[PDB]
C-alpha cells in the first residue's frame, strides 16, 4: 500500500508499517507507552502511520514553538478529523481555518480573568455541596471513589457555570439534565469504532450522510432544545450561555446552532477532565502525606478558620499551584497535541509535505529524563518559584501552546483549585488496602487509571 514510503524517502526513522494497518498494532499498550518507546528507540524526531495517515512526531523545543505559535495561522491551523461530527462541525475545537479563527474570536472574551472572577461565587457554592457529600461518606467510614464524588462536583460546576441550572447531581443522579450530560465522556480513540475509523477513514463520509454522529444524537437533541428553552425564558425575563447570548447581540455574530455547539463542547471539555485530574491529584496527595500536610498548612495560613476561598486568595497559594502543575506533568490528560500541516513547508531545517499530521508527544516529554530528574517521582518542588524558570514551556504542555491552546485553561485550574481548597480544609485522604499503589495507567486510548481511585476520607473534626 501507498503512501507508506514517505518517511523512508525523507530519511526519517520509524517503525515499519503494515499494509492498511500502518502501525496501529503498536497501540496495544497505549499512546503513552508507544510514544516513550519511540522517543527512546528513534530519538528527537520519528514517523509512523495511523493507517495511511502519516504522523510526524517532534521533540525539539524550538521546532515545537514554530508549529504551535509562529506558523499556526499560516501552516498549522487545524487538528486532524477523527470521526463523523454532524452539526458539531461548528464547535470551535473542531472547526477549521477562518471559521475557527472567527469562533475563537467570538468566545475569547468569555474566558477572561474578569468573567472568571465573576463566576467564582457560583463554583464556590458547589464546593460546599461537595463537602457535605464527602462528610456523609466520611462519618460512615466507607472508602470513597473519587471519580464519582468529583464527577458529581464537576457536573455541578458545569450545569451552573454554563446554564444557571442548579442541581445536586450526586443526590439527583436521575434528573433529566444530569442524565444526558453524564453521557458526554471522553472518546476512547482505541475502542473498536475509532480504530476502524483510522483503517477505514473513507467511512466517515458514509456515516455523515447517515446522520450517525460520535456525539450521540439524543444528548445533542436534548440540549439543543434545552438551550432554546432557557434562551427564550431569559429572553426576556452570569453563565457561559448568557455571555454567548450577549455576544450575538470574526464578525457575522454567533449563529443559533453555532451557540448550541460551543455550549456542548464546554460540557464535554470540562466534565471528565476536571473529574479525572482531581482524582489524580488526590491520589498523589494520599500517597505523599507530607505534601498533603504542607498544602493543608498553606490553606489554613491564607484561609484561617476554614475561611472561604476567593479569586485573589486562590492565586495567592503557591504550593497549591505547584501540586496542580506537577500532577498535570505526570498525567497530561490529552497525552499529545496535533496539527495538520496544510502546505509544503520547511521549519527549523526539515521538509514537511502537505497533509502530514505533526504530533507533539506530551506524555512522553513530561517524563523525559533529558529534561526532568527522576521523572517518575512526584516532586512538586520542580515548580517552586525558584525552579519554575528552568522549565521549557514547549516541553511542559498540559494545555497546549499558542493560539489554539486550551481556551478553558484559566477556568479549569481555578475550578480544580476551589475544589481542592474546600476539600482539604475539612478532610484528610489516606490510602486503603484496596487502593492501587502504585497506580497503573489504562492501556486504552484515555489517560485514566486502570482501576478507579479509592481512598479513605477522614474529618479534620
Amino acid at each position: 500500500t501507498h503512501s507508506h514510503g514517505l518517511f523512508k524517502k525523507l530519511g526519517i526513522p520509524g517503525p515499519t508499517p503494515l499494509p492498511f494497518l500502518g502501525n496501529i498494532l503498536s497501540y496495544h499498550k497505549g499512546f503513552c507507552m508507544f510514544d516513550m518507546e519511540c522517543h527512546k528507540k528513534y530519538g528527537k524526531v520519528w514517523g509512523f502511520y495511523d493507517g495511511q495517515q502519516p504522523v510526524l512526531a517532534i521533540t525539539d523545543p524550538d521546532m515545537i514553538k514554530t508549529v504551535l505559535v509562529k506558523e499556526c495561522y499560516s501552516v498549522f491551523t487545524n487538528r486532524r478529523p477523527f470521526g463523523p461530527v454532524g452539526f458539531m462541525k461548528s464547535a470551535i475545537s473542531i472547526a477549521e481555518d477562518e471559521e475557527w479563527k472567527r469562533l475563537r474570536s467570538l468566545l475569547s472574551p468569555t474566558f477572561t480573568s474578569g468573567k472568571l472572577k465573576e463566576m467564582v461565587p457560583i463554583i464556590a457554592q458547589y464546593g460546599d455541596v461537595l463537602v457535605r457529600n464527602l462528610r456523609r461518606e466520611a462519618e460512615t467510614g466507607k472508602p470513597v471513589t473519587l471519580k464519582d464524588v468529583f464527577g458529581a462536583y464537576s457536573m455541578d460546576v458545569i450545569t451552573s457555570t454554563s446554564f444557571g441550572v442548579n442541581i445536586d447531581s450526586l443526590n439527583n443522579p436521575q434528573d433529566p439534565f444530569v442524565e444526558n450530560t453524564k453521557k458526554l465522556l471522553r472518546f476512547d480513540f482505541l475502542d473498536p469504532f475509532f480504530l476502524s475509523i483510522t483503517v477505514f477513514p473513507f467511512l466517515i463520509p458514509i456515516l455523515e450522510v447517515l446522520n450517525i454522529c460520535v456525539f450521540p444524537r439524543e444528548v445533542t437533541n436534548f440540549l439543543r432544545k434545552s438551550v432554546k428553552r432557557m434562551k427564550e425564558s431569559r429572553l426576556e425575563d452570569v453563565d457561559f450561555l448568557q455571555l454567548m447570548i450577549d455576544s450575538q447581540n470574526s464578525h457575522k455574530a454567533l449563529s443559533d446552532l453555532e451557540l448550541v455547539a460551543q455550549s456542548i463542547i464546554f460540557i464535554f471539555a470540562g466534565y471528565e477532565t476536571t473529574s479525572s485530574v482531581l482524582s489524580f491529584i488526590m491520589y498523589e496527595l494520599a500517597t505523599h502525606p507530607d505534601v498533603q500536610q504542607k498544602l493543608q498548612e498553606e490553606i489554613d495560613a491564607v484561609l484561617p478558620n476554614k475561611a472561604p476561598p476567593t479569586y485573589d486568595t486562590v492565586l495567592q497559594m503557591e504550593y497549591l499551584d505547584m501540586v496542580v502543575n506537577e500532577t498535570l506533568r505526570l498525567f497530561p490528560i490529552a497525552m499529545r497535541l496535533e496539527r495538520v500541516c496544510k502546505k509544503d513547508v520547511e521549519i527549523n531545517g526539515m521538509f514537511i509535505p502537505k497533509g502530514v499530521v505533526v504530533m507533539i508527544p506530551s506524555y512522553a516529554l513530561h517524563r523525559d529524563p533529558k529534561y526532568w530528574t527522576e521523572p517518575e517521582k512526584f516532586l512538586p518542588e520542580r515548580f517552586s518559584k525558584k525552579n519554575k524558570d528552568n522549565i521549557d514551556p514547549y516541553i511542559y504542555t498540559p494545555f497546549g501552546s499558542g493560539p489554539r491552546n486550551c481556551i478553558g485553561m484559566r477556568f479549569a485550574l481555578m475550578n480544580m483549585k476551589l475544589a481542592l481548597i474546600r476539600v482539604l480544609q475539612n478532610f484528610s485522604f489516606k490510602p486503603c488496602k484496596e487502593t492501587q499503589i502504585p497506580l497503573k495507567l489504562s492501556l486504552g486510548g484515555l489517560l485514566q487509571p486502570e482501576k478507579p481511585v479509592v481512598l479513605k476520607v477522614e474529618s479534620r473534626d
Copy 2:
C-alpha cells in the same frame, strides 16, 4: 436503474419507481395510507420498490394461506433483513432457515398454555400495582397519559415474567434495570436512518464490521451481563429465563449467547406493543361508553366483589375477547406481514421469482370495505360468537399466521386482559377536552397515535 422492470415484465400493476429511490417517496403518509391507496388503485395484487427491493403485495385469502402456511418451510421462511444486527442475528424473530426452525423448536414449550397459566399469579400482582398507581392519579383529578401508566405496567410484567426482578417502574423510573429496558422501543422504519438503509442496503455490511447495531450496544451489554449474573445466582441457589435455562439442560441445545438474544427480543416484543395496544383499547372504551359499561358489567358478573381474575375466568369473558380483537382490527400494530421468497415459484397461478418480498398489508385488509361493513367504526359485535365464523383468518391477521406467527400471542392477549380486568374493576375512563377525538394515526413508520392518548380516570368509589 435495474431491476426496476420486474413488475412491468410480469404484467403486475404498481406505482412507477424513481431511479434508486423506488417508491419510498410514497411513504410520506405512512405504510398504512400507501397500502390502502394501492389496494384501492390497483386491486387484488400490486408491486412496488423499496429502493431496488421489489415488494409484491397480495390480498387473496387463498394465496395468503399458501405463503404463511403451506409453503412456509419450503419457500417463504424468512423475513427481510432491515439493518445491522450484531449478535442479535441469533434472535428467533431475525434468524433464518434451520437456525430459525431449531430456535422456534427450543422455545415453543415456553409459550404453552401450561407455562402461561403458571405465569398468571405474577402478572396479576402488577395489575394491583397498576391500580394503586392509577388511584393516585385519580384521587388528584389530573388527566392521565396511558402510555406512561401502561408502559410502567408493561415494563413491570416483563421484568418479572422474564427475570424475576420485581420493580415498581412508575415509581422507580431510574432503577438501572428500568433505565436500560425503557430504551427498547419499536423501530421507526421511516426515520432518516432506516430510509437510508433501504436506499443504501449495501451499507449494512459496512456497519456490521464496525460493530454498529440498531440494538444499542450498551443496552445489550447491560443485560448480557445482567443475565450471566442472574444465571449464576440461581445456579445454584417460573420466568422465561428459567424456562430457557431448564431447556439448555433442533437439538444442539441453546447457546449462552443464543439465550441472551431471545431474552432481549421478548422485552422488545412485549413492551411498546402491550403498552401501545392497551392505549388503543382504552381510547375506544372512553369514546364508546356503552361498550365500556357492557364490559364492566361482564367483569362484575364473572368476578363479583372485585374478585381477582384467573386464567380460567379470563378465557370465560367473551365480550372482553370481542373488545380486544376489534381493537387489534382497527390498529394491527405490525401493519404488514412479510416473507422472502427464497426460490422461483408459482402459487395460485402467479409466477414469483426468487428474491422478491411477498407482503400482506394487514392494516389495509382490516379496513377493507369488501370484507367489513363500516370498517372505520368500532363495533365489537363483529366478533360475537355468532359472527366470529364469517371472518377469514387470512384477512384478520394481527399476530400473523402459520409456523412463523407471533409466538407470544397467548401471553400478550392474557397480559393485556389481566390489565384491563383489574383496571375496569376499579375505574371508568372518560374523554377530556384535551383528548384527541377522533384519534389520528402517526404518519411515521409506527402504528401509534399522532398525539398521545390522555383520558379522565374516575374511581368507581
Copy 3:
C-alpha cells in the same frame, strides 16, 4: 434530506429537489436542455442540486467577470471534483490552489505564440496525410464519417506535437501507441457510473483506496513507461514533452510523475475536442454552401496555387476565424464552466456561502435571444470585424475566461484551422441522403451529435 433548503432560504429560485437525487432526474434531456429551460423559467440566476451539492447558475456578465477573473485566485480557484483520479490528481486541469497555480506557471511558456509558431510545420505535414486519406475516400465515392477521418487527423497531430512519434493512425489503427491513446475519450457525466458518483460522492474515497481510476489504469501505465522510454532515449541523444523536459531543468520544478500527468491531460484535451469541433464545422459548411464557397475563395486568395498555410497566413484569414468562432457558439463543447466557491462571499450584491458550485451555462448563453438574433441560425457575420465589438466576452465563452481558461486555446484554434485550410483547398463537402439534417444533439452528457456526421466529399479535381 439536508442541505436542500439552502436556495429557498436565500430566496433563490430553482426546481424543487427530491431527497438524495436533488435534480438529476431533470438531466434526462441533457445539461443543455435543462440549462435553457431553467434560464427561461427562472431568469438571470437560479439554483439546483447535483445530489446534495448545491449548484448556483449565473448569467449576468458583470458577475461572471468577478467569478472568472477578479476573484479567481482569492475565491473561485478550483473546479468541482468528479470521480476517483489516482495520480491524475497532479494534472493541471484537476489540481487545486497553489499546486494548480504552480503548475499553470510551469506550463504557460509552453503554449506561447512563439512555441506554437514552431510547432506549425509538424501540424502541417499531417494535414497532407489527412488529404491523401480523404482523397482515397473521395475517388471511391463513398460517404465519409468525419469523426473517424478527423479523429485520425487529431490523433496524428497529438502524437507528434507531444512526443515526436509519427504515425498514420487512420492506416495504422492498431499500432500500440494508437491503440491506447484512442481510449482517452470525453467523460459522459450522465452515464450510470458518474450519475452514481453524484448520488454517492462518499464513494469516491472508496474507489481511491482501491486504485480504481476514471483514467483506465492500463492506458496510464502504458504511457507512463512510454514517456520514461522517450525521456531516456532523447536524454541523451520541439514537442510538448521536450518543452516540459527543458522546463524541469511555482518553482519546485516539475516532478517526473507530474510531467506524465500533463502529457496525458493534453492528449485527453486535444483528441475528441479537436475531432468533434472539426465535425461540427464541416456539418455547417456542408449545409451552408454559400459560406463554404466564400471561405474557399478566401483560402485561394491568401494561398493561391494550393499554397501551404503558415502561422502568419492563418491569422490573416478573417472569414475562417468567423466560421470557427460561430461554430463554437452553436456548439461550445464544454457546455458549462464551473468554479468552487471556497469561502463565504458577496459579489455584485449576492451572498454566496462556502462550498456552492458557481456554474456558467455556456451552451444556453450562446443561444440566448437576449444577446443573439436568431440564435439557432448559422450566421458567421456575427463575428465580422464590424460586429465583433458588440459581443460580450463573458457571454461568448467557448474556452472559458480568466486565469483558469483553456491553456490550449491558441493551439486548438491553430490546429483546427490548419486542418480546415488544407481540406478545403482540395475538396468540397456536400450533404448525403443519409446525412442528418437538421443535426440533433446528443441527450447524453457530451456535446456531440445524436448520429455521427456523414458527408459527400468531392475533389476540386
Copy 4:
C-alpha cells in the same frame, strides 16, 4: 477483531491472524509456497483467515472425497464469491445451488465424447495453422515465446469451437474479435484490487450497484451483441453456440443472457489455461530431451508419414497422456479447490461450522513427499499403465473432482494433445541460453512462470 477465534476454539492449528488482515501478509510468496509451508508446519489439516473469512485446509483423501462428491449437493455446493460479477452471476462456474444444478444440467450434453469427437476436425485445422506459424519462426532461427504462439493457437481453437468465427489470430492480432477476446485473462487474486476485496468484502455490494465488474464492461458488451448477431444470422440460414442454441429449443430452458454468460466463461476458461499448460509441457520436453524423443517416436508409430491425428488415435497415445498428466501434476494451474460449507456439519469426525471455506491445496499435494517420490522431478512414468493404479484420485486433482469438477476436462485434454501431436510431428524444441532453467514460478496469485518460456525450435526438416 472477530471471528478470529474460531480455529483456536475448535483446536485447529494455523498461523496466528492479524486484526482485519487475517493471514494475507503470508501470501507474499504466493498461495503455493504458503500452502506447502502450512502443510509442512501444521500437518494434515490447518486453518487461516482471508481477512475475516475462515479457511479450513484439508489433506486426507477420505475427507476430500466427502467434500467433493458425497456431500457436494447437500453441503458443499458453491465456491466462494470473489468480487463484483454483474450479469456474469449467471455463469455456471459462478452460479449457486439450484441455478447451478440446472445450468450444469443444460450444458452437460455439450461436453460429451460424441460432441467432442465432432469438434476435432475444427481443432485440427488450427494445428496446421500453428505449424506454418511455427515454421516461419523456425526458418528464421529466432527464439520463440510459447505463450504468444500457443496463445494464438488457443484463441484460434476457441473462436472456432464456440462461434464458427475463423481467424489467424497470430497474423490478425488486431481483428475486433481477436482484440476483445484477448482481454479475458486469469484473475490475479493477489493484485491490489482483489487483496482489497478480501479485506473489504463489504465493498462488493458497493461496486455491484455501480455496475463495476471484474469482467470488463466493454468486452462483455462486445460479445453480447456479437452473439445476438451470430444468433440471428444462423437463425435462420457444430460449435458451442449452436449446441446451446439447440438446447434452448433443470428445465426452464436457457435464457438469452444465460447463454451469453456461458459463452464468455468458456473463452475465459480455455484461453490462458490451454495456452499456459502447453507452455509448461514444452518447457519440460525441452529440458528432458529423452522424454521428447520418446514421445516423438510414439507419435510417428501411431501416425506414420506425419499422418493427421484423429479422436481415436489421440486416445491411443499412452506416453502422451503420461506427459500431459505429469505436467499438470507439477503445475496444477488452479492451485486449490474450494467449497463453501453451507451448514453446520461433521464429516470424517470433524466439526465444520456454517460459512467456512473448505480448501484443498492441490499444488501442495501434487508435490507432497508422502505420496510422490522425488516430487520435484519430471518423471512421466508415474502415470504408466503400471503405476497409474497407485495414484489417489483425491490427491491428484488438476480438474477437481465430483459433480462440480471441470466440465471442460475432456475438451481441454483433447485440445492440448492435438496441438502437441502436430507440433512434435514437425519440430524439436531445445533450450536457449536465454531460457530460464530451472523455471521459477510466479510469486503472484497465478500459476505461471516468473519469466515467459523461450525456446529454440528446429524443423525435423
